Amino acid sequence: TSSVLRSPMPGVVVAVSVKPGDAVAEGQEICVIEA
Amino acid sequence: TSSVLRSPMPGVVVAVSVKPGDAVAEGQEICVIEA
Helix, strand or coil, X not given: CEEEEECCCXXXXXXXXXXXXXXXXXXXXXXXXXX | CEEEEXXXXXXXXXXXXXXXXXXXXXXXXXXXEEC
């Protein structure tokens, strides 16, 4: 019933586009990480 | 140089574990989405 998203790399989070309670669509941006 | 993480499914974000400026390790939890 649930998905846990993890970072694919070491880096720094530069943007986060969602907060708890927001809906998401498949393919919708969650965050951006710089290497 | 950068990674864009997207939702793998339609759902609702139930938890977000990072904010801009935080470091992440490979495999570190970003968020949890419920279907």
